[PDB]
Design a protein around this ligand. Structure first.
Ligand SMILES: CCCCCCCCCCCCCCCCCC(=O)OC[C@H](COP(=O)([O-])OCC(O)COP(=O)([O-])OC[C@@H](COC(=O)CCCCCCCCCCCCCCCCC)OC(=O)CCCCCCCCCCCCCCCCC)OC(=O)CCCCCCCCCCCCCCCCC
Ligand SMILES: CCCCCCCCCCCCCCCCCC(=O)OC[C@H](COP(=O)([O-])OCC[N+](C)(C)C)OC(=O)CCCCCCCCCCCCCCCCC
Lengths: 37, 124, 365, 231, 90, 206, 49, 108, 54
């Protein structure tokens, strides 16, 4: 926790943010794989 | 009878007007209501009223207008052990009982067929 | 695919302000024939961000009208010209409406976009049915704190040189120079890489824009000049309760001062109940703000937009008769009396619906 | 849309949202037998039975003008119960009312019954008007059915059943014809039918499909503006 | 520990062990009481052999636990524990 | 047949079980799930082919290998009659199923009537706009029934505003800054008087 | 006061109970569209599924 | 003795039971006729009206119907104790016994 | 089977009060006084002009 707090201080990502839909990392991977595949 | 195009809306929604200069200065205060007639429109009081007795009473009235609905009404008001006609489903207990009592009844159908097929002749 | 259709083109720098073409996204409506809506996004802001608002089944705005999400000159994909005169920028829309065969349209805008929408109604009122302005007012905003930041950020963006600066040098520049999260995100997405990755640049003309804002004179976008005149048609204003752009205390008077038909608060001017938050300008992000704007928007399009001035609502079309001024008609043997004003089809010029219905009427008789 | 912002809106000197015992100076105080000589009070223990007989009267005296309409008698009962169940279901603590809520409501229902005995209660005259308008619409359907003609209500039901078939014959990717989809289809028809009443359907254009109706119109010579000037 | 225990003269098939040993490391056995884990093993294996027979064949022939088998197996192990009559209180 | 033929059947049981809250319902859901898995258990054992000629040649008792073949083939012809079962299960289902087939129908008709009420209100509400720009008697015509209620108050002389309203919000808005902030008591009539009076050994009824 | 309370006094954390007039109007003052909508929902879901 | 029925004037008929078996059948037919009653076939002599969707106000409507069919004048003090089918049967008997012994109807 | 349905004959009319009319309502309210009031002062006098009379 201490080291994490110290360190604290992609088109699919933007499109989903426009619809203010919470997106998980797993979903982003599948969509990217779906396009490339 | 004539119904027009399902896609098209009434011409009122499509018909528009535009402004120009000069403009009338008068700002309308109220809507004109020369004749007191508001027929064929339901009251807006019936907006956010919770479920009550009028729901099952009006349901029977409309159900009794159909042949299949008349059977539901007679069976519900006679062959259902409920302390009220305001039916509220919060559990699937009564629903699972009726399924296990039915889907299970059709067991042994295949084993029964095996009896006939296997009792026909002896392999030996 | 089908519902979403945005024509594709390349911006062209133009020396003549009349040879300017506008480009934007078009959202097709559910029904066959519907009037059109032209919506202007915030300056330097993406049109795509407004798609979920106009394409939400809960709101169902497309059920009422077809939407043209259009970019003004020097913004987005539209052509580029150093002048920002609202009279010139208004004629651009009129040519777009002509090239697209649009007789008259509903105009909308967000922030400075609201100004652009109202200017068209001020310069071309006979072809505008109504105006719906969101968090904007026909007012001089040069000295509003919200405008200064935007005016300040645009000036900082002129320091970056994409040729020499690397991708990381840019990201560091924005975070430090741009504090507002939304403006920062808007500007990042406005950066684009031309074909052959020659170099990255902003979609909007940073040079022409900064001069308009930095000069901070009548032609500035924050300013609203007396030259723009008066809007004669239907106008509805919706803004947050606590908004940095439109203050409820005095920034409502310009609406009465510029819009002749504006009745007042509670009829054509509303405020959305909300807290103090600098991000409330972007209503489409917060459901609470958007739900009220949509309901008020659907109400303006359904009952108030494109309705004659002296009529209360669309319900009065065909049942309320307007008084006539004496000696207003060419016919001399005319008994002057009350009449219901004529409301025409939204694209009666580029179609033959009147010629067609005239024939059908004869068949009856 | 708009919510009350004042947090102390429901505050009273007697508590939050207290509409049963507002605070007053002359508050109720007890009485002691050994020290009490005489007393003048109107409170009694007869409100329960008066609550029972009042129902029997308001019901029996209202049925005199229902003409044996069984569907109306049952409908009136549901409405009558909603009037007697107010003290049992209200947020107001009717058991904590100042000087007895039981006597208060009974005395209130008695004033309604007095008007009912004369057939002058606004609920009665409203029920007669509402019912007559309902039967006139039901009899119109009956007269059209005895002639084998189709009712405007059945034409909609048949027009909606076929539209569902057309919309679900193309909905093959999914197979969940939600109640939401069934609704918007019916509303779209309602809006076109609603506008058709004022502007009927002359030709294939359909209900309210003529642009010429929305051109400049004038009052007829035989019916000018009676209420004001025209020019 | 309760899972690895085994009676005398009761050998287990390789494929059957993979299923039981899988449920243990994943932590599903933490739900039911320890005294019920040993009997759960017997009931679970019998339930699998009858209903889920294609699953055992793939694990046997291919000798590998594919992702499809993991999802199916990972879904039935919590499900079965709720189906059978066990002491769910950990 | 084997793959994907049971995916849809798993969603139906999952939703059915998620709706179960009481332990008794959960138990019957488990019983139902077992029956489904029992009927849906797949059987794949690679039914082997018999080559009677091979056994007939290597070694066999005279008449045995042939007798087994002719008798084995006879039973292979016999097969289940899926047609007969398909018709009976479709015509009549059961008794208990009819009990809920008619219960859930009336149940849905109750809540479809409420769904229609809310829907038709929002449909009529489209003609209502700017409540502040309608005349007094035209607004009361939209909310048909308020005039009748307003007459009952007048004819019973309940002319104290908000007396018959459980939540007299209009009274609270008018008393936000009133001295002795109070609202009228519920169902208060301007004519009722419950004042009492007593005489004690002390004066003034004390 | 009567007009405002009967249109703005309801809340979601409480039950709004139907009055006499609201009972007669729902049962004996429904229009044609309301009669059609109910029968439309019943036939599609309760009869035709 | 006449009443309107669906707009038509019909002569009202009164019943005289004077027998236990005829009373139990009349009450059930009466309770099953009320549109508020649930589980009409599950209703028996030992059925609590509360278990069939009936409250204190529904017992009044039932008593009001007993006066129509039998001609009794039931007092308000007796109605609120009729909460079971058994209660209507015993009250009807007590009324028949009172008139057979005292020669007059009970106090209303 | 549903198509074979029919409709019963409803009642002809409910009770008609011999002393209540739309113009002479028996009971009193401010709604009817409002109708008589706006009939007296007349409807809103809408001006069609571009400038006020004064
Ligand atoms: C033998 C020969 C003799 C006869 C010869 C013939 C001559 C006959 C004379 C007839 C003249 C023509 C008549 C034309 C119409 C009436 C006059 C008029 O101005 O109407 C237009 C005027 C507004 O014009 P508009 O553009 O059409 O209205 C637009 C908006 O709707 C208005 O509202 P807005 O706010 O939206 O817009 C702006 C508004 C802003 O200004 C206002 O709105 C004014 C505010 C007034 C309302 C405030 C509340 C007070 C009223 C309460 C009601 C009390 C009376 C009722 C109670 C008792 C019951 C009887 O109007 C203005 O722009 C300024 C006001 C006009 C200029 C100032 C005029 C002041 C005098 C008018 C009132 C008369 C007072 C009594 C005098 C008589 C003494 C006995 O209407 C009125 O405001 C009220 C008219 C009532 C006038 C009654 C008297 C008639 C006699 C007229 C003679 C001239 C006045 C003599 C008085 C001299 C004192 C200094
Ligand atoms: C012009 C049109 C005609 C108008 C007619 C008169 C309009 C009357 C308007 C209503 C106000 C009436 C004042 C009543 C007092 C309300 C305040 C109160 O209750 O006191 C609480 C007060 C205030 O409590 P508070 O907490 O609500 O407010 C405190 C105020 N601050 C915040 C500033 C400290 O507290 C008390 O308990 C004092 C009790 C004594 C009150 C004195 C009442 C005397 C009047 C009663 C007799 C009148 C009957 C006349 C009958 C005539 C018959 C012929």
């Amino acid at each position: 926790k201490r080291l994490l707090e110290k360190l604290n201080t992609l088109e699919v990502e933007n499109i989903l943010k426009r619809y203010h839909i919470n997106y998980t990392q797993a979903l982003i991977d599948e969509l990217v794989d779906w396009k490339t595949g | 009878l004539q119904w027009g195009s399902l896609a098209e809306r009434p011409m009122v929604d499509r018909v528009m007007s535009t402004s120009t200069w000069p403009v009338p200065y008068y700002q309308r205060l109220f809507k004109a209501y020369p004749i007191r007639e508001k027929k064929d429109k339901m009251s807006l009081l019936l907006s956010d009223i919770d479920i009550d007795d009028t729901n099952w009473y009006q349901a029977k009235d409309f159900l009794r207008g159909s042949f299949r609905g008349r059977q539901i009404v007679d069976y519900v008001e006679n062959n259902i052990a409920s302390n009220t006609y305001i039916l509220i489903q919060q559990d699937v207990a009564n629903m699972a009982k009726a399924y296990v009592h039915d889907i299970c009844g059709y067991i042994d159908v295949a084993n029964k067929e095996n009896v006939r097929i296997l009792s026909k002749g002896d392999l030996i | 695919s089908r519902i979403i259709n945005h024509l594709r083109g390349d911006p062209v720098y133009q020396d003549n302000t009349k040879d300017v073409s506008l480009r934007g996204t078009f959202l097709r409506g559910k029904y066959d024939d519907l009037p059109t809506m032209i919506f202007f996004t915030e300056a330097c802001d993406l049109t795509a961000n407004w798609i979920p608002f106009f394409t939400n089944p809960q709101y169902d705005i497309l059920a009422h009208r077809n939407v043209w999400l259009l970019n003004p000159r020097n913004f987005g994909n539209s052509d580029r010209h150093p002048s920002f005169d609202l009279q010139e920028m208004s004629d651009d829309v009129m040519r777009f409406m002509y090239s697209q065969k649009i007789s008259m349209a509903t105009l909308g805008g967000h922030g400075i976009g609201g100004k652009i929408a109202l200017a068209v109604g001020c310069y071309h009122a006979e072809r505008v049915t109504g105006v719906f302005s969101i968090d904007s007012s026909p007012m001089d905003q040069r000295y509003h704190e919200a405008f200064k930041e935007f005016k300040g950020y645009v000036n900082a963006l002129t320091e970056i040189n994409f040729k020499t600066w690397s991708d990381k040098d840019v990201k560091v520049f924005l975070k430090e120079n741009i504090k507002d999260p939304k403006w920062r995100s808007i500007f990042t997405n406005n950066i684009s890489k031309n074909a052959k990755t020659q170099s990255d640049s902003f979609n909007f003309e940073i040079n022409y824009l900064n001069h308009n804002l930095n000069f901070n004179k009548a032609d500035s976008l924050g300013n609203w000049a007396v030259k723009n005149g008066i809007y004669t048609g239907r106008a509805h204003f919706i803004f947050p309760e606590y908004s940095r752009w439109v203050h409820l205390a005095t920034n409502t008077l310009p609406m009465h001062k510029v819009c002749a038909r504006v009745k007042g608060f509670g009829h054509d001017i509303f405020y959305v109940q909300g807290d103090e938050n600098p991000l409330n300008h972007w209503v489409y992000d917060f459901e609470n703000y958007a739900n009220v704007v949509a309901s008020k928007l659907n109400k303006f399009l359904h009952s108030y937009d494109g309705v004659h001035a002296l009529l209360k609502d669309r319900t009065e079309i065909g049942n309320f008769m307007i008084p006539d001024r004496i000696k207003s008609r060419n016919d001399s043997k005319h008994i002057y009396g009350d009449y219901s004003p004529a409301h025409l089809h939204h694209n009666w010029r580029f179609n033959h619906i009147y010629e067609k219905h005239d024939e059908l009427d004869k068949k009856l008789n | 849309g708009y919510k009350i912002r004042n947090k102390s809106i429901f505050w009273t000197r007697a508590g939050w949202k207290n509409n049963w015992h507002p605070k007053n100076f002359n508050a109720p105080r007890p009485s002691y037998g050994e020290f009490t000589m005489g007393i003048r009070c109107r409170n009694d223990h007869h409100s329960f039975l008066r609550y029972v007989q009042t129902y029997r009267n308001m019901s029996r005296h209202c049925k005199q003008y229902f003409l044996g309409d069984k569907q109306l008698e049952e409908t009136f009962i549901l409405g009558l119960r909603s009037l007697f169940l107010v003290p049992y279901d209200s947020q107001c603590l009717t058991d904590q009312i100042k000087h007895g809520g039981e006597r208060r409501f009974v005395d209130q229902l008695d004033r309604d019954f007095e008007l009912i005995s004369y057939n002058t209660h606004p609920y009665q005259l409203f029920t007669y008007t509402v019912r007559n308008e309902h039967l006139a619409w039901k009899n119109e359907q009956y007269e059209k059915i005895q002639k084998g003609e189709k009712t405007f209500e059945q034409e909609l039901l048949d027009y909606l059943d076929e539209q569902v078939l057309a919309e679900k014959a193309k909905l093959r990717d999914g197979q969940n014809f939600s109640i939401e989809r069934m609704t918007e289809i019916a509303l779209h028809v309602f809006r076109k039918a609603r506008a058709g009443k004022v502007r009927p359907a002359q030709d294939v254009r359909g209900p309210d499909g003529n642009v010429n109706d929305f051109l400049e119109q004038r009052r007829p010579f035989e019916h000018p503006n009676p209420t004001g000037v025209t020019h | 520990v309760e899972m690895l225990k085994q009676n005398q003269y009761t050998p287990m098939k390789v494929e059957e062990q993979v299923c039981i040993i899988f449920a243990g490391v994943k932590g599903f056995l933490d739900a039911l009481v320890t005294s019920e884990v040993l009997k759960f093993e017997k009931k679970f294996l019998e339930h699998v052999r009858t209903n889920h027979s294609a699953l055992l064949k793939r694990i046997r022939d291919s000798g590998d636990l594919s992702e499809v088998d993991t999802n199916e197996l990972n879904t039935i192990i919590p499900l079965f524990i709720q189906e059978g009559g066990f002491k769910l209180k950990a | 047949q084997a793959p994907g033929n049971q995916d849809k059947i798993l969603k139906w049981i999952s939703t059915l079980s998620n709706k179960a809250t009481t332990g008794e319902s959960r138990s019957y859901c488990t019983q139902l799930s077992s029956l489904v898995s029992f009927y849906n258990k797949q059987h794949v054992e690679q039914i082997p082919t018999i080559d009677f000629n091979e056994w007939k040649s290597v070694i066999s008792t005279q008449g045995l290998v042939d007798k087994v073949k002719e008798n084995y083939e006879s039973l292979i012809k016999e097969q289940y009659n899926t047609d007969a079962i398909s018709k009976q299960i479709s015509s009549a289902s059961s008794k208990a199923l009819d009990d809920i087939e008619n219960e859930l129908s009336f149940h849905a008709a109750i809540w479809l009537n409420a769904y229609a009420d809310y829907t038709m209100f929002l449909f009529e509400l489209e003609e209502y706009n700017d409540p502040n720009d309608y005349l007094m008697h035209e607004n009361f015509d939209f909310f048909r029934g308020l005039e009748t209620e307003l007459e009952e108050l007048t004819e019973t002389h309940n002319y104290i505003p908000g007396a018959k309203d459980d939540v007299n919000l209009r009274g609270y808005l008018a008393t936000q800054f009133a001295w002795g902030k109070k609202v009228i008591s519920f169902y208060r009539h301007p004519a009722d008087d419950f004042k009492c009076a007593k005489a004690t050994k002390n004066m003034l009824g004390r | 006061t009567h007009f405002f309370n009967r249109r703005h006094s309801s809340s979601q954390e409480f039950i709004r109970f139907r009055t006499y007039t609201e009972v007669l109007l729902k049962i004996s003052a429904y229009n044609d569209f309301f009669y059609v909508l109910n029968n439309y929902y019943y036939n599609q879901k309760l009869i035709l599924k | 003795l006449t009443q309107y029925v669906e707009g038509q004037i019909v002569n009202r008929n009164q019943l005289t039971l004077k027998k236990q078996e005829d009373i139990e059948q009349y009450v059930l037919k009466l309770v099953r006729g009320y549109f508020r009653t649930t589980n009409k076939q599950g209703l028996n002599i030992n059925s609590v009206l509360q278990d069939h969707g009936l409250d204190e106000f529904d017992s009044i409507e039932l008593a009001m119907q007993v006066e129509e069919d039998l001609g009794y004048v039931i007092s308000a003090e007796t109605i609120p104790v009729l909460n079971k089918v058994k209660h209507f049967v015993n009250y009807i008997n007590h009324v028949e016994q009172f008139k057979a012994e005292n020669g007059k109807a009970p106090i209303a | 089977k549903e198509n074979t349905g029919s409709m019963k004959k409803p009642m002809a009319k409910a009770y008609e009060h011999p002393y209540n009319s739309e113009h002479h309502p028996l009971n009193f309210s401010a709604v009817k006084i409002a109708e008589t009031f706006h009939d007296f002062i007349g409807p809103e006098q809408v001006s069609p002009h571009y400038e006020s009379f004064a």
